[PDB]
Amino acid sequence: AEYIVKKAKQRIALQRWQDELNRRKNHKGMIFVENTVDLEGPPSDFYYINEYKPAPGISLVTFGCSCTDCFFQKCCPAEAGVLLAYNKNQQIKIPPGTPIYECNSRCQCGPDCPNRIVQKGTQYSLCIFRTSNGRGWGVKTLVKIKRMSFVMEYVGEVITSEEAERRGQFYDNKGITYLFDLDYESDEFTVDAARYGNVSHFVNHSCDPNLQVFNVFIDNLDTRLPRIALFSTRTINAGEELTFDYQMKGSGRVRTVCKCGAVTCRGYLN
Ligand SMILES: C[S@@+](CC[C@H](N)C(=O)[O-])C[C@H]1O[C@@H](n2cnc3c(N)ncnc32)[C@H](O)[C@@H]1O
Ligand SMILES: [Zn+2]
Ligand SMILES: [Zn+2]
Ligand SMILES: [Zn+2]
Ligand SMILES: [Zn+2]
């Protein structure tokens, strides 16, 4: 009875939140919201952002390449001492731990350069949905995603690692999960998606995940401050939940029990 009224208002609240997410988003794919399991409405104190929101005094970002064919000429990755990340079908072909150096605002090439993938934004329609076995909100794809494909970036506030430590003291276990050290080549900065984030803010942990982190440099060449991209590790089917390994944010208190469901589940998130 109280329940029935709450369900009815919940439906309206989730619709209004979906509409707001779609106004805020700057990428091609749609964002959907669904809760067929319980009465949870939209989270409070969460603001959708498309890119890193740096703290006061933190600056994010120029030479580019001059290729007429960035796929076959000596291009931005070459200049940085690395391989081109991508094959002709937009799939990442370099191993985890290798940085992605995409072409940038200073390169001569246009949008359809095969070295401009992360920067084009998420192409897939995705749904924030309520999980059925106690893992809160999660994210699923509504369409099939090819192996080794760009899905979404991890974004949040960009703060110092010192700030994240201090913030973490007042965070519960969930809040700590929103801290993402940018430790590719430096211990200086941390992404905090707790309050400001994109759809990656709702992606759950798995012990056999279907997404994998890569560091990305576009206009930014300072390796203290990589952008973080999530690429698929395998073919992901329509309707499938997206997951990454929270322990693999980089290659560097109650223990939360892992409910990922994998046969090889490690039992705990932390
Ligand atoms: C970054 S949040 C992800 C979205 C979150 N499920 C929500 O409702 O907003 C991480 C938190 O989600 C839950 N979670 C994610 N993966 C889980 C898993 N495999 N098993 C149990 N809980 C999980 C835990 O509460 C964890 O602290
Ligand atoms: Zn080039
Ligand atoms: Zn370039
Ligand atoms: Zn290019
Ligand atoms: Zn697990």
Author numbering: 13 to 73, 77 to 267, 282 to 299
What is the paper's account of this structure, in its own sentences?
SET domain methyltransferases deposit methyl marks on specific histone tail lysine residues and play a major role in epigenetic regulation of gene transcription. HKMTs catalyze the transfer of a methyl group from the co-factor S-adenosyl-L-methionine (SAM) to a substrate lysine and, with the exception of DOT1L, are all organized around a canonical SET domain. Methylation of H3K9 in humans relies mostly on members of the Suv39 family, namely EHMT1/GLP, EHMT2/G9a, SUV39H1, SUV39H2, SETDB1 and SETDB2, as well as then non-Suv39 enzymes PRDM2 and ASH1L.
The Suv39 structures G9a, GLP and SUV39H2 adopt a typical fold composed of a conserved SET domain and variable I-SET insert, flanked by Pre- and Post-SET regions, and characterized by canonical features such as a pseudo-knot next to the catalytic site, distinct co-factor and substrate binding areas meeting at the site of methyl transfer, and a narrow substrate lysine docking channel. Mono-, di- or tri- methylation of H3K9 constitute distinct biochemical signals and are established by distinct histone methyltransferases; G9a and GLP are mono- and di-methylases, and SUV39H2 di- and tri-methylates a mono-methylated substrate. It is partially folded in the structures of G9a and SUV39H2 in complex with SAH and SAM respectively, and fully ordered in the ternary complexes of GLP with SAH and H3K9 peptide. As previously observed with other HKMTs (for review), the co-factor contributes to the formation of a hydrophobic, mostly aromatic cluster (composed of Post-SET Y1211/Y1154/Y261, F1215/F1158, W1216/W1159/L298, F1223/F1166/T285 and SET H1170/H1113/H220 in GLP/G9a/SUV39H2) necessary for partial folding of the Post-SET domain. Surprisingly, in our structure of SUV39H2, Post-SET Lys-264 is inserted into the partially formed substrate lysine binding channel, which may represent some form of auto-inhibitory mechanism. (2) A loose conformation when SAM or SAH, but no peptide is bound, which may also accommodate non-specific sequences.
